[PDB]
Write a protein that binds this ligand. Structure first.
Ligand SMILES: *[C@@H]1O[C@H](CO)[C@@H](O[C@@H]2O[C@H](CO)[C@@H](O[C@@H]3O[C@H](CO[C@H]4O[C@H](CO)[C@@H](O)[C@H](O)[C@@H]4O)[C@@H](O)[C@H](O[C@H]4O[C@H](CO)[C@@H](O)[C@H](O)[C@@H]4O)[C@@H]3O[C@@H]3OC[C@@H](O)[C@H](O)[C@H]3O)[C@H](O)[C@H]2NC(C)=O)[C@H](O[C@@H]2O[C@@H](C)[C@@H](O)[C@@H](O)[C@@H]2O)[C@H]1NC(C)=O
Ligand SMILES: *[C@@H]1O[C@H](CO)[C@@H](O[C@@H]2O[C@H](CO)[C@@H](O[C@@H]3O[C@H](CO)[C@@H](O)[C@H](O[C@H]4O[C@H](CO)[C@@H](O)[C@H](O)[C@@H]4O)[C@@H]3O[C@@H]3OC[C@@H](O)[C@H](O)[C@H]3O)[C@H](O)[C@H]2NC(C)=O)[C@H](O)[C@H]1NC(C)=O
Ligand SMILES: *[C@@H]1O[C@H](CO)[C@@H](O[C@@H]2O[C@H](CO)[C@@H](O[C@@H]3O[C@H](CO)[C@@H](O)[C@H](O)[C@@H]3O)[C@H](O)[C@H]2NC(C)=O)[C@H](O[C@@H]2O[C@@H](C)[C@@H](O)[C@@H](O)[C@@H]2O)[C@H]1NC(C)=O
Ligand SMILES: *[C@@H]1O[C@H](CO)[C@@H](O[C@@H]2O[C@H](CO)[C@@H](O)[C@H](O)[C@H]2NC(C)=O)[C@H](O[C@@H]2O[C@@H](C)[C@@H](O)[C@@H](O)[C@@H]2O)[C@H]1NC(C)=O
Ligand SMILES: *[C@@H]1O[C@H](CO)[C@@H](O)[C@H](O)[C@H]1NC(C)=O
Ligand SMILES: OC[C@H]1O[C@@H](O)[C@H](O)[C@@H](O)[C@H]1O
Ligand SMILES: OC[C@H]1O[C@@H](O)[C@H](O)[C@@H](O)[C@H]1O
Ligand SMILES: OC[C@H]1O[C@H](O)[C@H](O)[C@@H](O)[C@H]1O
Ligand SMILES: OC[C@H]1O[C@H](O)[C@H](O)[C@@H](O)[C@H]1O
Lengths: 390, 390
């Protein structure tokens, strides 16, 4: 979408995976979806270095709405959970130097069952602009027909544009086409800043694997469409929660960098391990994700339960990730000819190789004819950066 | 098996899951299956508190053998990897106050392809006894017929007995039988100290879940057979490796306690996190696994992606584990009437409840009509002990 936004993948925090649709403020006041949750997160995004690392969008997912529209046909924030309204939350967020994201749905209802924007696109776009919203995530539930789906996504894109406010537009259009029609990404890119392709992530290695496998399976369709202003969205980072081993977390961070993915954390910033924080704030890995050239990476090789992915970067550099998918035994040795990397130009006549994950260390110069040997933990990933010089 | 052994579930270390069949001592000298690996582990079992916590069996799995039997028809240790032979390793292990386990197979070959004991049962039992072996794990690969399978397992049991040496006999009889025929556990219990029921574990949550699910599914058939001298074997603890989150590790430790499982660690004792060490050496949890009454636990309840398991302990105490199988969101609240626990007798008229995992804390006294409220991390478990008094 040519609105000057998302020139690099959008970075931020999104409540959904960790907090979901928790409406019970009596029993669980500190984790229900409320204005206090978001205000506390916004404070921590500043004080704990997240904004400095690049995480600038604080995003509200489903279950912020009251069950009914107001008398003027507007969506309204839940009166008990957001008693001061969204405008005041947006102002609070803006006062911290952050941007506010919000959620809505193209059909008759949101996926959690609250009011949808079908029949109200202009009104909802105008409401969001008036409130000071900076990002809209626009979901595809309860939309009966595919032509209503596409028209809805287009209409909302145009309506947001007509407000004159700069709003990042995050779509789920291709995901909801999945069963019925081949998405046209040229068309989607024209109307959206990013688009969800695959089923919702959860806090599990099974989920990370299916997203990676669906992406490499479909890379020939989707990798080239991506670029400044328009990204594939493989869903939230779930690092710092409960279901991933340390090595599986490293794998997610490295591969979301390779994929030029938007980086939306979904975790509890109040209770996050120092290890998870350092990984999510890793400046060299973030610099790969945020590379100005914005060329999405891809799977180069798979065999013997190993996978090699690579991403072309600016300045003739390359990022390379090697994943060990064998979920038994110990660290396994993997060797690759550096002449196979970067279409044969990454290390001709030579390249300097730096390991970024799981720990940072300089590996030295590698001649075009040389071999790279690595040891990769099960379910883990080694991430490398290849450069002309150190 | 009435040989006076395994009156509580056997505790020890087993190489297989972490080190597998690594024969390459040139490239990977520190992780190939060799006498040095076992000698180092034995040292650490003593110096790092493992023996004190109760782990006394140091066990060699498959791939210790030379490709051929010697001219006297005996199995031999690989000459390059075990140059000093099994007897000297057994003596070294015994000198540390530990016991040595070894592996063989009832059929023509071991699962990794080395010599099987079919046709050599007496010779092999005698070899193991003469070496000073204290435990035999006896696998079921390369055995065509089920009557040869059963006869073989029985024969070896009787042959071990005839040596006069006290040897723990760990079988895989029901596992190799199940695909074709319902095993007879009365018969298996007569001949074996423990028996593997289900497919090999690996370093994954998927694997832990399938073992738990197969066990609760089949609990009517297997729970009552277990007791002093004869245990169900749900396979190795894989805590301290690569594929499990912290909460999934707690789940394994708690449930293996509830299930009266032999506790065979398969990890690298040279490189284990302090967290994993504390969990595996947790004395109150180990005391549950090793409870003298030796009544296996069982799944009491399942619903809403929760599971409640319980185990009767000596002194009218009970152990209760509550597992959250919802792999999205945050810690979920779970409430249960203490009157549902221990068939209604656990907290009549009252009981003192202590949480053991994920952290130890006393919860005070609970009357028969009370309700217990807990918060359970996703893929995590809360483990409680119910007693008459503190
Ligand atoms: C090879 O196979 C043989 C079996 O086919 C093994 O022999 C068995 O070994 C058992 C364990 O030693 C033994 O069981 C014990 O028997 C003791 C006496 O019991 C008789 O007398 C009782 C009155 O005193 C009477 O009530 C019983 O009915 C018996 O007739 C007894 O002291 C033992 O109890 C003590 O130890 C057990 C631990 O095992 C504790 O649970 C118990 O609280 C107490 O402290 C035990 O009694 C009971 O045996 C039956 C069993 O169901 C109960 O669980 C158990 O409590 C058993 O009698 C014989 N069986 C036969 C047929 O002889 C043999 O073991 C070796 O030999 C024995 C004698 C002993 O020296 C062991 O240490 C040896 O390993 C096997 N040999 C090898 C090398 O594997
Ligand atoms: C509603 O829709 C219309 C589109 O129909 C939007 O208008 C478009 O707005 C963008 C604003 O950035 C504008 O892009 C710029 O165009 C001028 C040339 O006319 C350039 O100076 C800009 O380049 C500079 O900035 C960009 C950062 O975005 C950077 O990439 C460059 O290196 C340089 O610093 C920029 O040119 C674009 O550069 C990126 C390339 O992919 C684009 O093709 C190229 O145009 C569009 O030209 C403008 N289009 C039209 C037809 O007016 C409008 O912004 C939107 N409104 C809201 C509120 O969303
Ligand atoms: C997927 O959707 C995209 C975007 O709409 C399609 O590309 C577009 O195809 C149109 C043809 O239907 C092009 O319109 C033409 O414009 C010229 C003016 O220069 C006219 O002379 C001509 O009559 C058409 O009106 C349009 O240029 C093009 N847009 C972009 C941004 O490329 C795409 O069509 C397919 O790909 C393009 C590149 C062409 O090769 C088409 O022939 C081809 O069908 C859509 N994909 C599919 C599979 O239909
Ligand atoms: C499973 O194995 C058990 C132990 O070998 C069998 O029980 C034994 O059966 C013998 C005759 O086959 C009999 O002399 C023994 O008394 C008896 N031993 C014990 C400890 O119970 C069992 O056989 C079944 O149950 C017995 C009681 C009889 O009813 C038999 O006719 C049954 O076949 C075996 N069960 C099965 C299902 O094969
Ligand atoms: C969806 O909403 C529209 C307009 O708001 C309304 O006319 C229509 O009846 C609704 N559709 C269904 C299936 O309820
Ligand atoms: O198909 C996935 C990728 O394959 C590469 O060979 C190509 O250079 C990329 O542009 C992309 O097409
Ligand atoms: O559901 C299986 C379990 O059921 C319990 O009620 C019984 O006490 C256990 O021994 C076990 O059989
Ligand atoms: O209900 C909210 C939920 O709805 C859909 O499933 C979306 O794909 C999710 O990302 C989340 O926004
Ligand atoms: O090759 C050794 C291997 O053989 C079988 O698969 C067993 O079930 C495993 O526990 C292990 O002993």
């Amino acid at each position: 979408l040519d609105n000057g936004l998302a020139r690099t993948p959008t970075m931020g925090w999104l409540h959904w995976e960790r907090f979901m649709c928790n409406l019970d403020c009596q029993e669980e006041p500190d984790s229900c979806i409320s204005e206090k949750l978001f205000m506390e997160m916004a404070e921590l995004m500043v004080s704990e270095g997240w904004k400095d690392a690049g995480y600038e969008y604080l995003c509200i997912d489903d279950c912020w709405m009251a069950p009914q529209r107001d008398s003027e046909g507007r969506l309204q924030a839940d009166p008990q959970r957001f008693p001061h309204g969204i405008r005041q939350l947006a102002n609070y967020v803006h006062s911290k130097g952050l941007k506010l994201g919000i959620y809505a749905d193209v059909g008759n209802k949101t996926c959690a069952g609250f009011p949808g924007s079908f029949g109200y696109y202009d009104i909802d776009a105008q409401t969001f602009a008036d409130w000071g919203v900076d990002l809209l995530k626009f979901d595809g539930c309860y939309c009966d027909s595919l032509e209503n789906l596409a028209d809805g996504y287009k209409h909302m894109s145009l309506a947001l544009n007509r407000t004159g406010r700069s709003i990042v537009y995050s779509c789920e259009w291709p995901l909801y086409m999945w069963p019925f029609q081949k998405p046209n990404y040229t068309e989607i890119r024209q109307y959206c800043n990013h688009w969800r392709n695959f089923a919702d992530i959860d806090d599990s290695w099974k989920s990370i694997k299916s997203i990676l496998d669906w992406t490499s399976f479909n890379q020939e369709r989707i990798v080239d469409v991506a670029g400044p202003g328009g990204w594939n969205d493989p869903d939230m980072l779930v690092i710092g929660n409960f279901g991933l081993s340390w090595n599986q977390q490293v794998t997610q961070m490295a591969l979301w960098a390779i994929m030029a993915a938007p980086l939306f954390m979904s975790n509890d910033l109040r209770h996050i391990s120092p290890q998870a924080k350092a990984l999510l704030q890793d400046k060299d890995v973030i610099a790969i994700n945020q590379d100005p050239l914005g060329k999405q990476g891809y799977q180069l090789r798979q065999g013997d339960n190993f996978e090699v992915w690579e991403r072309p970067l600016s300045g003739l550099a390359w990022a390379v990730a090697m994943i060990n998918r064998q979920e038994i035994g110990g660290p396994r040795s993997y060797t690759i000819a550096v002449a196979s990397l970067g279409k044969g130009v990454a290390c001709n006549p030579a390249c300097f190789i730096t390991q970024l994950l799981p720990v940072k260390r300089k590996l030295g110069f590698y001649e075009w004819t040389s071999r790279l040997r690595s040891h990769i933990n099960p379910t883990g990933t080694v991430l490398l950066q290849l450069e002309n010089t150190m």
